[PDB]
RNA sequence: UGUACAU
């Protein structure tokens, strides 16, 4: 059911096409493929009227455009380069549909991009509409999105509604695979009284997490960004279970990121942790310097280890070469300690 | 030689 104009633009019949010469037909070009890209484009270069022009005719139609698979750009693109008139008249358009928006597959992108540019007393006006819907949107393929995108641009004093919604489901969330990228937003932009009480579950599950192939992740953001004093309650739980939590896909990762990420003494008496304590009939530093994970882990104290300590370890593996060479996860190893004697 | 985000 296009119309002859659409047609002929889409078959190269209007090398000149102005913006004034398809009003009238501004929403059927939004929904087409190359009718959103040729009004995205003309729009940068456009004239205050000209677009008002094109503002008159997605305002009236603003809802269908922004659940369309094309639509949803051109109104994106007021957000970032109309008016401040046009964006408030947009954001009025949302107002009442705020959560269905963000449940949908085009409509969440909009919502994001008038996230990222409407004034906070708007931003603010946005997120309450969440407010009642925080785990359906965080648990949802489009929701999250929204959720995350809120974290990052909305005053941390407007989102209290979801550190309150959280209390009681941090692992569980820790453990999904849209959750954990939201704990991640909720540690690097809120409060203080608010990753408080996330970072208290956080450690009460330290140990199931690391071992989970999202949570995982959740820790090892805070070893790589959070404060000292809740590093050390992650390497306290990691100290001591050193060498099976290196012989793990998910966790040896997080071992990593505390022999990289620890205090200066935390760091060495983790590497002495391996160079010590032995593994049943066999020294610990035997059986990680040839596991298919834990040989990164060996490697990685070969890096952060000051000359002193990284001469014991060097002079506690010279004597398993022969052994090493027989193994090809630990080929990479050989290559550190020959660089070395 | 080893793990996660959508038009």
Do not use: W
């Not at 995205?40 to 008159?56: D, I, S």
């Not at 603010?124 to 489009?142: A, I």
């Not at 641009?153 to 919604?165: E, H, K």
């Not at 739980?237 to 290196?246: C, P, T």
């Amino acid at each position: 059911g296009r119309s002859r104009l659409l047609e002929d633009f889409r078959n190269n019949r209007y090398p000149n096409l102005q913006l004034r010469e398809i009003a009238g037909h501004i929403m059927e070009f939004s929904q087409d493929q190359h009718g959103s890209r040729f009004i995205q484009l003309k729009l940068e270069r456009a004239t205050p009227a000209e677009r008002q022009l094109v503002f008159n005719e997605i305002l009236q139609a603003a809802y269908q455009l922004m659940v369309d698979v094309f639509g949803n750009y051109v109104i994106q693109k007021f957000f970032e380069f109309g008016s401040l008139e046009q964006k408030l008249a947009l954001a009025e358009r949302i107002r009442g549909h705020v959560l269905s928006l963000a449940l949908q597959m085009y409509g969440c992108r909009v919502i994001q991009k008038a996230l990222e540019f409407i004034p906070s007393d708007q931003q603010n006006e946005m997120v309450r509409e969440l407010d009642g819907h925080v785990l359906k949107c965080v648990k949802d393929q489009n929701g999250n999105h929204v959720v995350q995108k809120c974290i990052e641009c909305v005053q941390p004093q407007s989102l209290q509604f979801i550190i309150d919604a959280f209390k009681g489901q941090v692992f569980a969330l820790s453990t999904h695979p849209y959750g954990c990228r939201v704990i991640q937003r909720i540690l690097e932009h809120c409060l203080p009284d608010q990753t408080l009480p996330i970072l208290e579950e956080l450690h009460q599950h330290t140990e199931q997490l690391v071992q989970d192939q999202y949570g995982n992740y959740v820790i090892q953001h805070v070893l790589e960004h959070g404060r000292p004093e809740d590093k050390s309650k992650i390497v306290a739980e990691i100290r001591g279970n050193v060498l099976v939590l290196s012989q793990h896909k998910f966790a040896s990762n997080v071992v990593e990121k505390c022999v990289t990420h620890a205090s200066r003494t935390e760091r060495a008496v983790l590497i002495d942790e391996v160079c010590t304590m032995n593994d049943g009939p066999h020294s610990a530093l035997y059986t990680m310097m040839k596991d298919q994970y834990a040989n990164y882990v060996v490697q990685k104290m070969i890096d952060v280890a000051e000359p002193g300590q990284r001469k014991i370890v060097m002079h506690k593996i010279r004597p398993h070469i022969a052994t090493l060479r027989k193994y090809t996860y630990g080929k990479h190893i050989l290559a550190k300690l020959e660089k070395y004697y």
